[PDB]
Amino acid sequence: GKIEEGKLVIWINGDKGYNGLAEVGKKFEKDTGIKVTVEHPDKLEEKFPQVAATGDGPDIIFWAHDRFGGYAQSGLLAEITPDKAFQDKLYPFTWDAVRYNGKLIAYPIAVEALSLIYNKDLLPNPPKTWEEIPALDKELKAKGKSALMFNLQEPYFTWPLIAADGGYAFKYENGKYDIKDVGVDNAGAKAGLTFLVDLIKNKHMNADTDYSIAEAAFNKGETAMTINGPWAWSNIDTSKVNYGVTVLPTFKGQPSKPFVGVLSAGINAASPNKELAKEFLENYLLTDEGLEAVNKDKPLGAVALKSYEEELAKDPRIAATMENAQKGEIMPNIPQMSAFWYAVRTAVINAASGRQTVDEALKDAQTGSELYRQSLEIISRYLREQATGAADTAPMGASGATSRKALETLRRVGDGVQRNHETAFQGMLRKLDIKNEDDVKSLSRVMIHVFSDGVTNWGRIVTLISFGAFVAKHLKTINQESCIEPLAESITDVLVRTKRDWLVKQRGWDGFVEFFHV
Ligand SMILES: CO[C@@]1(CN2CCN3CCOC[C@@H]3C2)/C(F)=C/C[C@H](C)[C@@H](C)S(=O)(=O)NC(=O)c2ccc3c(c2)N(C[C@@H]2CCO[C@H]21)C[C@@]1(CCCc2cc(Cl)ccc21)CO3
């Protein structure tokens, strides 16, 4: 459970230029005598936060920037402190992608956007609209071909169509995300996902098509079109297909809006090799020579390094990548992105398979995407009003009727539990001996052990939160009132992470209000 000193272990996704990255490793070894091991484990973006939490895992993790804010919030990433001269070598917007709470938490590498990739021997002119693809598939089926195949197992690839007519993740306005405002189950998201489920119903696409199936069908010339990123171009070059890379089709006359990723390199907070990792990333990888070694293996897209991006900018495939990037949006890096992606992944798979309707599927995705913020609103307000004797005057905001009725229910059932179990609550309080901000952060491991060692039901959830309020009254008492909000975030995190699937099957806090209805 300790990262070894005097080497570098690196994790990067299996679709990226990991052999190219290993050659940059070898150059580092030649100068320093330090061995660089590059690994591409399956589901590395799920494995990282698990292994890093115990002070294990790689020295360096590569992913798109969207996952890095959760990593940072959980204390898993070393702060990045490049000097000016090095910061000035990368585009300022790429540094913005790896800024979390005013601190740089990664090195940006490259800008990725999806494009439409078409076979010019099947489709001299690619379609400008999604709406013309059914008619084009009918023409191509008559010659033993299909119009379009892309990965339907990862919401990344379907999001551009969902977003086109007004689906969104977290509303962005006046240079600010409203994390309360989620656009997964609106009329625009519904129209985009209904169009996708209609293509599958009409046998223009297959619900089971994944990355490998779509890639093989395009690269063998069986399908005229795919949707993929720059990393995919190497294998198409090898297939000798006469391909173009172009703007994604419009939907209802509006651009497809890809979620734009910055491939980023983070340093593990538990690494004893932080100076070696900084030296490797700044003076070996993020050079014209280091990025070229990776790019030549699998293309990176529009690199963060200004000197190299100027050389690659002339490539029409890159110009097309940035066209689809500027019609799209830079992904948020807020901790909730992980939950957003899980929720939308399940909705797309379930709608495509017929397991749920589009309305049922996006309903559950909206509930899943809102769950952390709504749970924190309820739990934070209950802890603080129990501590101080006075309620919060601030509007509840989005889904406010549910937050209000959940807080009302919690006051009734929670107060009942605190009273009937006052002796048991006092006994556990003294036994924990909670004195400061440090002791509060150690409760997280105890909460997970006890709250997860039992049945899932609303009764045990009321106990988690009610004991939370009991501790909050104590923290007010000992002039540790500034610990109540951190405590509320820790309780919320334990609840939503461990009971995510059960909470969504109950329709979240509406199920809570219903279950305890008098
Ligand atoms: C008897 O005393 C407890 C139970 N415990 C169980 C674990 N064993 C382990 C060995 O030591 C002794 C202890 C005793 C009590 F009163 C139970 C009455 C309830 C009503 C039940 C009938 S129930 O079924 O409905 N629910 C629960 O069993 C329950 C659900 C969530 C909780 C917890 C229980 N517990 C343990 C309860 C709290 C009071 O006494 C415990 C609290 C918690 C952990 C501490 C740290 C902590 C910190 C914060 Cl801020 C919030 C929650 C927690 C996590 O949440």
Ligand SMILES: OC[C@H]1O[C@H](O[C@H]2[C@H](O)[C@@H](O)[C@@H](O)O[C@@H]2CO)[C@H](O)[C@@H](O)[C@@H]1O
């Ligand atoms: O599908 C949800 C998924 O989307 C993004 O992951 C992309 C990644 O950004 C690309 O570099 C490429 O590897 O394909 C991945 C999709 O399979 C998000 O970055 C990721 O967090 C999210 O789970």
